[PDB]
Structure formats: C-alpha cells, structure tokens
C-alpha cells in the first residue's frame, strides 16, 4: 500500500483546495503547493486532522505538485500527484 | 544578544535576495519569504552554510517578512525584519 496519500476534500473548487495528506509513520510539519505553470512553492495552511488548505484569488490550475516536510525530518517533492480534473473524496498516491 | 538574526549577503539586489539566517541552538529546516504587499509565503532555496536565497522575475519589494521551521520543531513568523533599503553585510534581528 502507498506510503504517502493525498485525498481531495469536499469544498475543493477552482479557488479553494483542501487536501488530507498522510505519510505513514510520520506527521506533516509543512506542506507547499506548486500549481501547473508555476515556478513557486507556496505554503499551504494547516487545518484540523491532517487537512491542508489553499485559497487563491485566481483559478487554481492542475495538475498539482506538492512539496512537504515531516516532523521526523523527511523532505520530498511529488510532481503531478493531483490531476487537473480530480474527484472529491478520491485518494491519490504517487 | 538576539536569538534569531538575518544577515543580508553580497549579491542581493532587486531580483535576488540571499540571507544568512541563524537561530541560536537550532538549524533551519525551511525558510519562507513574504514580500511587502504579498499574501503568500513562498519557499526560499537552501544554499550552503545557513544561507537561503530567493530569485524573482519581478522586483522584490521590502520590507521583508520571514516564516521558518527549524529542525527541532520551532515555527515562527517575523514581520518586517529586513527593510526595503537594507545594507549588504548588516545583521537584522527582531
């Protein structure tokens, strides 16, 4: 079974993305997002229960790339993990 | 003496900022920058020896705000620490 998963949450739309991130055996310290066509890693906001969110004034363009840091020291980049046309409630894994 | 300091490095200009960050007794895991007038925390790139850099296509507008995460678990935000008109080689502390 995949060690890192990204589950899209209800409420996600063009200007709001909420993602439940899970790394087996560790917890997220910081999660950053890079939308398709962007060269910048922008910090996501830590929500409750492992959910991380991002609010934008312009439309968000996928596929989405995530970069994170865990509390035990892991740092990783996962490219195009969440597709442009994602489905609410589905789990994505690299 | 200040516990956290930000020293501006040679080479820093309108499109390139290099900052030596130091937190006594800890080491930086991630350092993010928010320029004046921005609502986004963008990740800086880890250089050698504690220096963190940021390259932009448009001019960088200070004062600069920094948000960081240390290897031992500290997370902090320091607003307007580096002024718009900074001097190369000078140390800034909150």
Swiss-Prot record, chains A, B:
Domain Expansin-like CBD per the UniProt entry, residue ranges: 15-94
Keywords: Allergen, Secreted, Signal
GO biological process: plant-type cell wall loosening
Gene Ontology annotations for the cellular component aspect, listed alphabetically: extracellular region
Intracellular or extracellular location(s): Secreted
Major localization class: secreted
Tissue expression pattern: Pollen specific.
Signal found in the keyword field: yes
Family: Belongs to the expansin family. Expansin B subfamily.
Protein name: Pollen allergen Phl p 2
Organism per entry: Phleum pratense
Gene coding for it: PHLPII
Range within the parent protein: 27 to 120 of 122
